[model samples]
Target: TCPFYKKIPGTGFTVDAFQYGVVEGCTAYFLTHFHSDHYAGLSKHFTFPVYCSEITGNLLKNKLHVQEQYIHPLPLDTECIVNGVKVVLLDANHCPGAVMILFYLPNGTVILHTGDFRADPSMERSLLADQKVHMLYLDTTYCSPEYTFPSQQEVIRFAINTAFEAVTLNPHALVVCGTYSIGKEKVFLAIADVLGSKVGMSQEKYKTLQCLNIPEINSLITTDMCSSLVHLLPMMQINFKGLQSHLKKCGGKYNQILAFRPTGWTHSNKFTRIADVIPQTKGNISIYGIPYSEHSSYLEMKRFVQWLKPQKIIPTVNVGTWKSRSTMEKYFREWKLEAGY
Candidate 1:
């Protein structure tokens, strides 16, 4: 069942292709990131020039098998003319090649589209310090007040400390922590800082990190700090059999393993029970669900919208429930009736 579909009011253009199909009048599509959900139907129908960061373009060029000419590469905060409209890209802080875009129309109108951004103080300060934004299309994936995701650094501290404690308790077990290669780059770096050279990185994961060009992607700790702690071990490679065999031969040389998989929207008990339904492991393999997320919590979304005070708010990607939009409208009507134009 397709949960993302929206009808273009009065234009008869149903956004049925992907994220409500091709939005009419949009000369080019600015993909802030390359996540599957945000990238569906891109190769299927949209042949227009897709703009993204250079690293993201490289990652997609190899993965999507699309023509290099079609994928336009731009730097962070690079302003360019897309089709006839002007667009600018900003660091989104979500993943290695993640970005946010600001669209400028000729008629003095501006739109800030936050694809999938987090509220890291450093990241937020870097982004907000630039220019004044007009309208912001945000990632409202987590729009409920009860959910509070600790920052990436905080989660790393907790996950590694816990893993270290487990290793201290049981010196014979393997502590395997799994995380995704995309957005969880910072999370893994955090673990590396604590584990030091004791941590071995995988080659396959190293390649992915190299492709992304983020210094903190796969490497353990800063180059200076990695002296006694982290070791680059290709543990997340496709040839898991060979890697596991090599690690076992290392014998008591290695005990704890940390695996990080930041895959969202795909956790099911019955579906993954074939392996261990729970990710926390304490035996030869121990997993931990680190408290790190890129999307804004429900309160953050509402508060950001309230601060921006947009005249009209519209959600591009989602189940098309209109719940978030409705909430935005309600807030604007109640407080900013006169201010909202």
Candidate 2:
């Protein structure tokens, strides 16, 4: 019944199914990435060996406590045979260790499962060269025209420069940057490097970074609040009311508290401006939700689908406004007609 779990009738290979153990006596399992939603039901007691990148396997062993014996490392961009089926892992460009999994079926039908990935030029070129695909499991997070936003790199620059401007204006202000559990390490790390400062995050977030063993970023973590001007907090806490009470209490020691949330949601029409400056309702703290995304927008998705021309499409997540199978099917039909594909 799960959308993530797909097994061939005769073949034993499974994709991203950790719940309820291995299905249909599956001989081998493939993991696309290490995101929590994708890794649900996986644990130390997992009975089957999981295949993924070295970094993702390390994350599974170190952070998730999955046993070392059950974790198998798959090299990115390399093809290998597993249980008579050929598989290849390609860089997904979504976050550290993310990948898109390609499987070659016996009947010459190619199935590609893009496990929560954004489009990259190099990866796109690779796909163009690869054999035609018969089925595509797409990452449909931003499956609407309303999701249109600038590229992630552009938003990263916007966020860093805006944060720098705020810090320069108020030297005593506390700068808080919002990020996800795994993604957006680049944003906080860039801020730290450019500002010649360190980032302070919760101990939990610190451990995740520590597991990555990245020298530059690992050295940037600081526990002392006053020791660093920029603080990296969880994404949820970067909003208006979330930081209000904390900033109100810190007003005595600091003149201001500026927060930046790097996400694609900022492109929503609900916000008057997409970047720079604080909203009218806010007080001492200025919050800017920059347009940074890790998924394709509706138009981007349409173009990608038309290029691939897969006979069937499946979505990974159930969230967002367009969440039903029929809705998405109809959505694609209309898009194909509009684009003449």
Candidate 3:
């Protein structure tokens, strides 16, 4: 859907893809995160010097097996000259090593490329205070007027409270959290923290987290399924059929399954708060679709655009469709016009 994976203007660096087999004039590649969608064209065989956050660079080598010689890991929020083009990797607040790229062109124009982000108050504070941005390469993932999901902390609390109640009542219930390869660690970790439960992950997944080196989280995660009631499994394994198989793996020690499917796709305008959202139950299996997303909500994007007020805005996700991107543009236009700059 997001076919806007192209080279940044005025630089020979291509971002996110090498769609046409090879970028004819591409000098370098930049990866914002380890998410497969963004790293679609990347592989061990395709050799190009890739610039990204240190954690993402490690993922490239460990997960994708990309050779070490081609990877350049940049420190977060620090500026470095990459072959004459000044670049900085600002914390994206999405995945573990995700970054919103900042570039200073030779012409002195500033460009901010938000690969993907949640518009937290801290991100607002980190922007180059009074400096005007020439163009904003935006991540319009949830750019519709309808997506007003609760804050990350709000949704996390709701998941924690909900999980606590379920596990407290049903002592043998197992808590399964749906998450991606690199993001949403906070959801299950909060559950582990409050419940005092060890997090169970697959050996491969455990090895991957070790590569990310996120403080003491690696120490808390166990490869053995028997030790943990709260298992942070892949998103693919959160469904009914998946849970059944996982239960068998645990020798049927757990009688009930309580899964948290945390994503913005579960949110809607019909529910104003996390409290209004309900869980889906099937027999002994309960699926809680918590709107704990890494992407910014519609109102957050509105606030972000209003605060930055860049010279021109480009929608990154819904680039190929006018229907999806049109109203999103309207919001940006309104936001830009509201401040009258």
Candidate 4:
């Protein structure tokens, strides 16, 4: 789902708020990434000009099959004028072509909408660090307290080692990692390297991966399922029934399945120990819900809210219920107060 207050007042721009049919007052649409939820309802007949990064623009045309005429690819870290407003695109640290948009309005307002991003400390030195954001839109997926997961590098290493260990014990077991259209490349790719197997994907998934322009990706992804024991399947196809179907398709080449569905919803804790997250086993399948989140943790969100110190802020996710929204808002106030912001 998109943000509740997706339409920025007086800006005539919507951030990652597609699927609403080019909203009533919006002159242009801004897509942060090509995630299905964000790009939902976008079709070829859409009229308005869309704005996004060049890589996202490529996916918009090739993957979604939207016409190139509607796409306006903005270069990263550069300020460009759109509808008389100064807009800047910074790497979102979420997916391949994701970006956090900083819009400088003509009326002297600065709005920074983080369209689903990870608040990595690596981005602490980026251009957004210095920019003054008056209005901030946050990715509040893990907003409540008790959401402290490890870093991406740490989780990636754990996934690689876990896959390597399981496969070594059972040579005929097929290792399948669940993923979205994009994102979480490091998890499966690293596992493939350690297991000495090629990363396998469906033919359509390979097309989307190609748009990323990732270095050495061509050598990493394999189409032939028989050639690779490790397969990168869609999120929906990671269950017991799905695993059985894939196993049947392999024609007795493998026995049992070790599936890792990397998700943030698993361990909600003050500080989750990655070791505690054991797999869910049902017969020939073992499902692991590793806390490999792309969104900021509660602690990380606290740090970000305090650091930016935006005069006004909006929680993008979990805005449905007043209870959830109130809880996150309280954290924001307490966080800003602690920092004297």
Residue 127 in candidate 2, Cα distance off native in Å: 5.1
Model 3, span 20-54: residue lDDT tens: 57776678888888888788877789787899998
Model 3 steric clash pairs: none
Ranked by lDDT, top first: 4, 3, 2, 1
* lDDT digits (tens) for residues 27-109 of candidate 1: 44556677876767765234667778898787767666667777888877666876656667778778878887766666666
Q: For all candidates, what are the clash counts?
A: 33, 0, 0, 1
* Off by more than 4 A, model 4: 1-4, 267-272
Q: What lDDT is obtained when candidate 3 is compared to the true structure?
A: 0.82
TM-score of 1: 0.69
Misplaced by over 4 Å in model 2 are: 1-5, 8-10, 213-215, 239-253, 266-277, 319-323, 334-341
User: Which portions of model 3 show Cα errors greater than 4 Å?
Assistant: 1-5, 267-269
- Each prediction's TM-score versus the true structure: 0.69, 0.87, 0.94, 0.92
The whole-model C-alpha lDDT of candidate 1 against the native structure comes to 0.55
Q: Which predicted model would earn the best TM-score?
A: 3
What's the residue-level lDDT of 204 in candidate 1? Answer: 50
* Between candidates 1 and 4, the TM-score winner: 4
